[model samples]
Target: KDTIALVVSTLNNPFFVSLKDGAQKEADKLGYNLVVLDSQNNPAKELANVQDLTVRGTKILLINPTDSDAVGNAVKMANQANIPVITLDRQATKGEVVSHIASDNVLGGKIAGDYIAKKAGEGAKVIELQGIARTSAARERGEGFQQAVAAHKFNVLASQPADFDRIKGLNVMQNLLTAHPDVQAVFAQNDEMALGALRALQTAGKSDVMVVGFDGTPDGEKAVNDGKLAATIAQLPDQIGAKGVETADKVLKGEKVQAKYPVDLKLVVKQ
Candidate 1:
């Protein structure tokens, strides 16, 4: 009966909420106590959570990093405590993470980019709303997006950071809209940002713009059904969480675990 601490990036988003639930449920089934702390998408807060958990002598740590670079400090603290750290959903730039667990963000981003390219057509004006730069998810997704769109002659209008928040997404998208009113397509790193962008597009009477978002949250699916979103890259967040905890248990038992456990991602679109 050891405690496994999970410091999630944020509970504000439904995707991470489901991830917390998955980890909690699996931990219960496995007869281990799991403590979850919300980082509020703040890198400093993430570090505070890690310090709190490590001080309490947590047997294992699972983190959904807020910022890859900032979380490294937290991971180093855990490493010093001899706690096995498992990263869920994101990675730390410098840390002794036993395993990294998450969906195929790069591949999903590629699929989204390819879909948008085909739907928007070559030379169409496109905007990319980014997440926090320090998160591996953001970097990987952006890399794949650029690679996928490299062959297409897209008029890349703007790419700006939204911090993976709904409000930021709204404001950033609005600003981009004001400057690039002719933009025909957009890709938000996550559904929260995508939904917010959709709101901005709707209010501006540009509902025809093909908007794509990552994370197939319920809201994202609804947007897709309403034709507000072109499609969403679906990530198995629950599975990601479950796998993180499962891997942590494996590590504790001195069993073999993969260095990286990648969940599947799919494109969710209404027919």
Candidate 2:
């Protein structure tokens, strides 16, 4: 059996902790040596993990990046060392990436769009708050959302990037509202963006606009419970992590892996 090293961003965060748990379970099911590294979301430590693993005989590297911008340094190091690199949950800036695995962001986006369309009535005027441009998660999610709304023929207006941040979401929503006060529904790529858009709508006295978000964060679910948000698409990190190990197995077996490996997503609504 070959070895796979999972270098996670941090262990203090339960999301990643659960990811490790799921990965280990899969590794046990298969016949592979699995090792994990944890830290306080430190970049230098992550590089060291890569280097020390370089000292060991490892076949594959799975990176759950704490910092996308900073992760390329370590990913490139693994690249030069002749190890296959796989990114989990997020993208690295640049490297000889073998494959990428994450929850199907497209499914999440489509579910959010489908929810808004069914409830918001026919021809509902909609605003789409995008994540950072060009990244697979951002672009893929937007692609599905657009595909969904198009078939239904909803009136879409003002699709713009918010960097998946609350402040950026708020500011962008504010500006969009100034130009198009008639928007009846909204789709934000993630919870942070959705929460911020909700704040903007609340302050604009547009309380009736139905809002949808991806990523089932605590505040986002809380907002859904408060009925301020229509719904949320929950990205399962543990499942994605498990999928990564499976993908690594395929890669090591010399089977061709797709450019992107996919796991499923879930829809969360008011309980």
Candidate 3:
């Protein structure tokens, strides 16, 4: 009997909370006991969590990395223990990742940029709220957004890191507002930050500015419906978690799995 473990960056965020729910549900259905650990967005804690899981005889490990580079050592430890590792949402830079399950974030970013371009029009000034600097999601999404924005001639007034925290998003957006008061739109790497940006805009009496975000979390969807957000890139976190468990099952059963499993992304705009 092999136990499975899910190591998430932080469960404080609603996205990861939903992901844990999905993974646990599927693991239960598959008749596997699951242990979930939260790193609280700390790299040291993430590594410690992995080691603890290993010590507990976890046959399969599913990890959502806090930092891509920093997670490599933890993945390596799993490899040394002969435990198969599947990464969910984020990839490790230095380990043998048996499978990576995530949405096409680059495409999601491009979708956000495309919607922003159309909503804000050509040559519109926009602010970009970035995620944690070292994560692949932040880098790839920013790249995709830049690629799409270039084609549309949208001027990015400022692209600043908000550490993917809502409070940071609020503070960063407030500072950016002072310098770029005339900015017409905003794009955040995730819904938490987007919602924070929206709050800042509302506080400043600039709620009319178009704001776009990634991760169609429940709140983000509600914001769109409530006319607070212009659009969001819906990355299926539930699906990602479910697939991570499913893949772990296959690997544990002596079945071969692919190197990458990509969940689909969708553009969620006000209907």
Candidate 4:
């Protein structure tokens, strides 16, 4: 009965597109006015989007922040306007959103670690390719990976930030291979990087090196089916988006939701 605004980083990514689809479905069923804005993964744009939505008399706001610190003041502004904000996937460090719905990134990272350790065997040298350094997903997933590998014998040779860019992934992996040709495995924080790493490894003739990635996008799942990618962590973006709308409903009813709501994740492996 209220209008809801869904603000996302980009529509180019299938993950966010699926999220929009799910959110739109729910909004249709619930008879709420739905509006969408693409922030293009820019924090300044996200803030402007939030403010514009607030001014447009939107009752609820669903946001996928571009950066952890950039959306703080925007959330605060929404709070001042009496508009409850629901955070999805990425988290903002400052300001309180009504609720946050996301996959358990740490658990997903741990799953990737276990898979890589077992696949690469003992004494394997692993390179962890991370996403945006300051984002919650990047930090939490990296932390989880380390925690899972702590009891194992695998050597974590190095970790580098790839900014979640496939081009950066390819370039960085190539550079690392030059220095450490004996690297046994690579863990990329997202499927985009994973695919890029695959290309780099292939060009470098390091075809035997195991590669694992997070976010089971279509390309990633296809890679898994082809047995090219070792494994992928699947985040239920559709489910998260649908659940966020439900959470927003509860919030509207003055019900208290947890500060964090973690959706489940799955590790998909070939064979």
Best candidate per lDDT, number?
3
Question: Considering lDDT, where higher is better, how would the candidates rank from best to worst?
Answer: 3, 1, 4, 2
Q: Can you give the lDDT of residue 69 in candidate 2?
A: 74
Model 4 lDDT tens row, 120-176: 776679999999878899989998988766856668888898878788999999898
Clashes by residue pair, model 2: none
| Model 2 per-residue lDDT tens digits across residues 1-271 | 7889999876744456667888988998988899998735677898889998976988899888766777789999998899999999877878889888887777778788888878987678999999766456787798899877887788888799987778889999999999999998999998888989999988899989888988776677889899989998977767777888999999888999887877668888888
The TM-score-based order of candidates, best leading, equals 3, 1, 4, 2
User: What local distance difference test score does each model get?
Assistant: 0.89, 0.84, 0.90, 0.87
On TM-score, the leading prediction is: 3
What's the C-alpha lDDT at position 11 in model 2?
Answer: 72
Worst 10 residues of 3 by lDDT: 115-124
List residue ranges in candidate 2 displaced over 4 A: 1-60, 64-77, 90-96, 242-261
Clashes of each: 0, 0, 0, 0
Cα-based lDDT at residue 3, candidate 2? 85
